[PDB]
Amino acid sequence: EFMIIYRDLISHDEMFSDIYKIREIADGLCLEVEGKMVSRITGVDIVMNHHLQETSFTKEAYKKYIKDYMKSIKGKLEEQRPERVKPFMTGAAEQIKHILANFKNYQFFIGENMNPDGMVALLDYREDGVTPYMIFFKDGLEMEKC
């Protein structure tokens, strides 16, 4: 019955909803959302459905951005879920290293409001080369349900 909407905790933008196959990955740090190409005008269904905007980054610019972004999420956790801080930080350090190491594989998308402090979702494709999937930071999302 219910449908859950995932909103960017910092920018309040709607990021996605549970109408897609969602998997928790990176030991609970991220949510991987699988989508489909929709040519209605080609595009990823997740991006079109939630009005995500594609953006671009130099690696050095992205590196500065996610460290500050993850630290802002750490601040929210210290306030709302203190026990989550340590595993979040350890996982964040590892995931940041992972994203930087595979930096060129991704396309970057932000919420409709395009708040520079908001989350930047990562898009890449499955091995079939046609099935898109997007990565979001679980702790940077708030759930809304109805």
PDB file of C-alpha atoms in Angstrom:
ATOM      1  CA  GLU A   1       0.000   0.000   0.000  1.00  0.00           C
ATOM      2  CA  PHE A   2       2.411   2.655   1.237  1.00  0.00           C
ATOM      3  CA  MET A   3       4.948   4.356  -0.988  1.00  0.00           C
ATOM      4  CA  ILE A   4       8.031   5.862   0.551  1.00  0.00           C
ATOM      5  CA  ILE A   5       9.609   9.092  -0.645  1.00  0.00           C
ATOM      6  CA  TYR A   6      13.296   9.678   0.057  1.00  0.00           C
ATOM      7  CA  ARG A   7      14.200  13.326   0.526  1.00  0.00           C
ATOM      8  CA  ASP A   8      17.607  15.034   0.632  1.00  0.00           C
ATOM      9  CA  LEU A   9      18.121  15.765   4.353  1.00  0.00           C
ATOM     10  CA  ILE A  10      20.108  18.937   3.610  1.00  0.00           C
ATOM     11  CA  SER A  11      18.247  20.453   0.628  1.00  0.00           C
ATOM     12  CA  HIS A  12      14.769  18.948   1.176  1.00  0.00           C
ATOM     13  CA  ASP A  13      14.618  17.951  -2.513  1.00  0.00           C
ATOM     14  CA  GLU A  14      12.754  14.774  -3.364  1.00  0.00           C
ATOM     15  CA  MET A  15      15.469  12.321  -4.522  1.00  0.00           C
ATOM     16  CA  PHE A  16      13.558   9.120  -5.356  1.00  0.00           C
ATOM     17  CA  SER A  17      10.725   6.928  -4.068  1.00  0.00           C
ATOM     18  CA  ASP A  18      10.376   3.203  -3.478  1.00  0.00           C
ATOM     19  CA  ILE A  19       8.800   2.497  -6.850  1.00  0.00           C
ATOM     20  CA  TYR A  20      12.208   1.112  -7.937  1.00  0.00           C
ATOM     21  CA  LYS A  21      14.282  -1.856  -6.795  1.00  0.00           C
ATOM     22  CA  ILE A  22      16.284  -0.477  -3.861  1.00  0.00           C
ATOM     23  CA  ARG A  23      19.245  -2.232  -2.274  1.00  0.00           C
ATOM     24  CA  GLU A  24      21.338  -1.234   0.716  1.00  0.00           C
ATOM     25  CA  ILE A  25      25.018  -1.409  -0.222  1.00  0.00           C
ATOM     26  CA  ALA A  26      28.434  -0.459   1.193  1.00  0.00           C
ATOM     27  CA  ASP A  27      27.593  -1.989   4.580  1.00  0.00           C
ATOM     28  CA  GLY A  28      24.560   0.213   5.100  1.00  0.00           C
ATOM     29  CA  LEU A  29      26.136   3.478   3.935  1.00  0.00           C
ATOM     30  CA  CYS A  30      24.348   3.802   0.569  1.00  0.00           C
ATOM     31  CA  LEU A  31      21.129   3.007  -1.181  1.00  0.00           C
ATOM     32  CA  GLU A  32      21.456   1.729  -4.732  1.00  0.00           C
ATOM     33  CA  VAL A  33      18.401   2.436  -6.875  1.00  0.00           C
ATOM     34  CA  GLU A  34      17.991   0.542 -10.122  1.00  0.00           C
ATOM     35  CA  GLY A  35      16.204   2.267 -12.953  1.00  0.00           C
ATOM     36  CA  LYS A  36      15.361   1.904 -16.626  1.00  0.00           C
ATOM     37  CA  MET A  37      16.006   3.905 -19.784  1.00  0.00           C
ATOM     38  CA  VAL A  38      12.827   5.647 -20.907  1.00  0.00           C
ATOM     39  CA  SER A  39      12.637   7.300 -24.319  1.00  0.00           C
ATOM     40  CA  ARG A  40       9.563   9.480 -23.791  1.00  0.00           C
ATOM     41  CA  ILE A  41      13.165  11.666 -25.316  1.00  0.00           C
ATOM     42  CA  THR A  42      15.667   9.186 -23.857  1.00  0.00           C
ATOM     43  CA  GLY A  43      16.507   9.347 -20.166  1.00  0.00           C
ATOM     44  CA  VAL A  44      16.729   7.478 -16.874  1.00  0.00           C
ATOM     45  CA  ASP A  45      13.323   7.018 -15.256  1.00  0.00           C
ATOM     46  CA  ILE A  46      14.630   7.953 -11.779  1.00  0.00           C
ATOM     47  CA  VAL A  47      16.113  11.230 -13.076  1.00  0.00           C
ATOM     48  CA  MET A  48      13.033  12.222 -15.048  1.00  0.00           C
ATOM     49  CA  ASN A  49      10.550  11.187 -12.333  1.00  0.00           C
ATOM     50  CA  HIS A  50      12.158  13.262  -9.596  1.00  0.00           C
ATOM     51  CA  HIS A  51      13.520  16.078 -11.731  1.00  0.00           C
ATOM     52  CA  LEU A  52      17.163  15.395 -10.860  1.00  0.00           C
ATOM     53  CA  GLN A  53      19.630  17.682 -12.610  1.00  0.00           C
ATOM     54  CA  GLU A  54      22.875  16.410 -14.110  1.00  0.00           C
ATOM     55  CA  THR A  55      25.987  18.331 -13.074  1.00  0.00           C
ATOM     56  CA  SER A  56      29.736  17.902 -13.545  1.00  0.00           C
ATOM     57  CA  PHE A  57      32.888  17.959 -11.422  1.00  0.00           C
ATOM     58  CA  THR A  58      36.640  17.964 -11.705  1.00  0.00           C
ATOM     59  CA  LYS A  59      37.932  15.264  -9.323  1.00  0.00           C
ATOM     60  CA  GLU A  60      39.609  17.855  -7.132  1.00  0.00           C
ATOM     61  CA  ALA A  61      36.379  19.833  -6.895  1.00  0.00           C
ATOM     62  CA  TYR A  62      34.382  16.700  -6.038  1.00  0.00           C
ATOM     63  CA  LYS A  63      36.925  15.650  -3.416  1.00  0.00           C
ATOM     64  CA  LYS A  64      36.492  18.943  -1.581  1.00  0.00           C
ATOM     65  CA  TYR A  65      32.714  18.735  -1.897  1.00  0.00           C
ATOM     66  CA  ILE A  66      32.092  15.183  -0.506  1.00  0.00           C
ATOM     67  CA  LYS A  67      34.400  15.612   2.454  1.00  0.00           C
ATOM     68  CA  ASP A  68      32.450  18.718   3.476  1.00  0.00           C
ATOM     69  CA  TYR A  69      29.137  17.043   2.576  1.00  0.00           C
ATOM     70  CA  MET A  70      29.876  13.900   4.584  1.00  0.00           C
ATOM     71  CA  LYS A  71      31.025  16.046   7.519  1.00  0.00           C
ATOM     72  CA  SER A  72      27.703  17.907   7.394  1.00  0.00           C
ATOM     73  CA  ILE A  73      25.886  14.567   7.598  1.00  0.00           C
ATOM     74  CA  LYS A  74      28.150  13.593  10.515  1.00  0.00           C
ATOM     75  CA  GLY A  75      26.913  16.745  12.259  1.00  0.00           C
ATOM     76  CA  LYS A  76      23.275  15.688  11.805  1.00  0.00           C
ATOM     77  CA  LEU A  77      24.071  12.233  13.209  1.00  0.00           C
ATOM     78  CA  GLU A  78      25.827  13.626  16.298  1.00  0.00           C
ATOM     79  CA  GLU A  79      22.540  15.398  16.953  1.00  0.00           C
ATOM     80  CA  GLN A  80      19.973  12.796  15.892  1.00  0.00           C
ATOM     81  CA  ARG A  81      21.739   9.416  15.997  1.00  0.00           C
ATOM     82  CA  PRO A  82      24.997   9.650  17.968  1.00  0.00           C
ATOM     83  CA  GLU A  83      25.625   5.898  17.952  1.00  0.00           C
ATOM     84  CA  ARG A  84      25.705   6.011  14.161  1.00  0.00           C
ATOM     85  CA  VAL A  85      28.634   8.478  13.973  1.00  0.00           C
ATOM     86  CA  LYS A  86      31.578   6.074  14.244  1.00  0.00           C
ATOM     87  CA  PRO A  87      30.444   3.451  11.707  1.00  0.00           C
ATOM     88  CA  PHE A  88      29.226   6.254   9.415  1.00  0.00           C
ATOM     89  CA  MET A  89      32.649   7.977   9.465  1.00  0.00           C
ATOM     90  CA  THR A  90      34.614   4.765   8.946  1.00  0.00           C
ATOM     91  CA  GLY A  91      32.343   3.724   6.081  1.00  0.00           C
ATOM     92  CA  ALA A  92      32.361   7.252   4.616  1.00  0.00           C
ATOM     93  CA  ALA A  93      36.177   7.283   4.519  1.00  0.00           C
ATOM     94  CA  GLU A  94      36.178   3.939   2.667  1.00  0.00           C
ATOM     95  CA  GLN A  95      33.390   4.921   0.247  1.00  0.00           C
ATOM     96  CA  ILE A  96      35.040   8.266  -0.548  1.00  0.00           C
ATOM     97  CA  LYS A  97      38.228   6.388  -1.418  1.00  0.00           C
ATOM     98  CA  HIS A  98      36.160   4.075  -3.615  1.00  0.00           C
ATOM     99  CA  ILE A  99      34.340   6.890  -5.469  1.00  0.00           C
ATOM    100  CA  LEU A 100      37.606   8.761  -6.095  1.00  0.00           C
ATOM    101  CA  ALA A 101      39.307   5.600  -7.387  1.00  0.00           C
ATOM    102  CA  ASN A 102      36.516   4.996  -9.881  1.00  0.00           C
ATOM    103  CA  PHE A 103      35.735   8.679 -10.430  1.00  0.00           C
ATOM    104  CA  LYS A 104      35.476   8.547 -14.239  1.00  0.00           C
ATOM    105  CA  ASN A 105      32.736   5.899 -14.211  1.00  0.00           C
ATOM    106  CA  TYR A 106      30.062   8.253 -12.893  1.00  0.00           C
ATOM    107  CA  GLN A 107      27.577  10.862 -14.008  1.00  0.00           C
ATOM    108  CA  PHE A 108      26.478  13.214 -11.184  1.00  0.00           C
ATOM    109  CA  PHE A 109      22.958  14.318 -10.330  1.00  0.00           C
ATOM    110  CA  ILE A 110      21.549  16.770  -7.795  1.00  0.00           C
ATOM    111  CA  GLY A 111      18.061  17.575  -6.518  1.00  0.00           C
ATOM    112  CA  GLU A 112      15.768  19.965  -8.373  1.00  0.00           C
ATOM    113  CA  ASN A 113      16.663  22.974  -6.184  1.00  0.00           C
ATOM    114  CA  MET A 114      20.339  22.501  -7.069  1.00  0.00           C
ATOM    115  CA  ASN A 115      21.517  23.413  -3.559  1.00  0.00           C
ATOM    116  CA  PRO A 116      25.370  23.049  -3.720  1.00  0.00           C
ATOM    117  CA  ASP A 117      25.338  21.651  -0.154  1.00  0.00           C
ATOM    118  CA  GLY A 118      22.791  18.998  -1.062  1.00  0.00           C
ATOM    119  CA  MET A 119      23.583  15.401  -1.969  1.00  0.00           C
ATOM    120  CA  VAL A 120      25.074  14.427  -5.312  1.00  0.00           C
ATOM    121  CA  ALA A 121      23.763  11.060  -6.540  1.00  0.00           C
ATOM    122  CA  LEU A 122      26.001   8.905  -8.714  1.00  0.00           C
ATOM    123  CA  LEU A 123      24.816   7.198 -11.897  1.00  0.00           C
ATOM    124  CA  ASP A 124      26.442   4.301 -13.732  1.00  0.00           C
ATOM    125  CA  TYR A 125      25.236   1.184 -15.607  1.00  0.00           C
ATOM    126  CA  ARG A 126      25.038  -2.563 -14.944  1.00  0.00           C
ATOM    127  CA  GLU A 127      27.285  -4.881 -16.960  1.00  0.00           C
ATOM    128  CA  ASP A 128      24.613  -5.145 -19.665  1.00  0.00           C
ATOM    129  CA  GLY A 129      25.453  -1.552 -20.535  1.00  0.00           C
ATOM    130  CA  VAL A 130      21.789  -0.560 -20.645  1.00  0.00           C
ATOM    131  CA  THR A 131      20.434  -0.777 -17.096  1.00  0.00           C
ATOM    132  CA  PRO A 132      21.134   2.437 -15.116  1.00  0.00           C
ATOM    133  CA  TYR A 133      21.451   2.532 -11.307  1.00  0.00           C
ATOM    134  CA  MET A 134      21.968   5.414  -8.925  1.00  0.00           C
ATOM    135  CA  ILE A 135      23.779   5.685  -5.616  1.00  0.00           C
ATOM    136  CA  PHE A 136      22.549   7.847  -2.724  1.00  0.00           C
ATOM    137  CA  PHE A 137      23.895   8.230   0.810  1.00  0.00           C
ATOM    138  CA  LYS A 138      21.428   6.590   3.188  1.00  0.00           C
ATOM    139  CA  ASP A 139      22.281   8.812   6.152  1.00  0.00           C
ATOM    140  CA  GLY A 140      21.711  11.882   3.982  1.00  0.00           C
ATOM    141  CA  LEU A 141      18.108  10.941   3.352  1.00  0.00           C
ATOM    142  CA  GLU A 142      14.921  11.268   5.344  1.00  0.00           C
ATOM    143  CA  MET A 143      11.944   8.992   4.671  1.00  0.00           C
ATOM    144  CA  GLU A 144       8.405  10.202   4.010  1.00  0.00           C
ATOM    145  CA  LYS A 145       5.551   7.715   3.692  1.00  0.00           C
ATOM    146  CA  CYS A 146       1.938   7.584   2.516  1.00  0.00           C
TER     147      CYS A 146
END
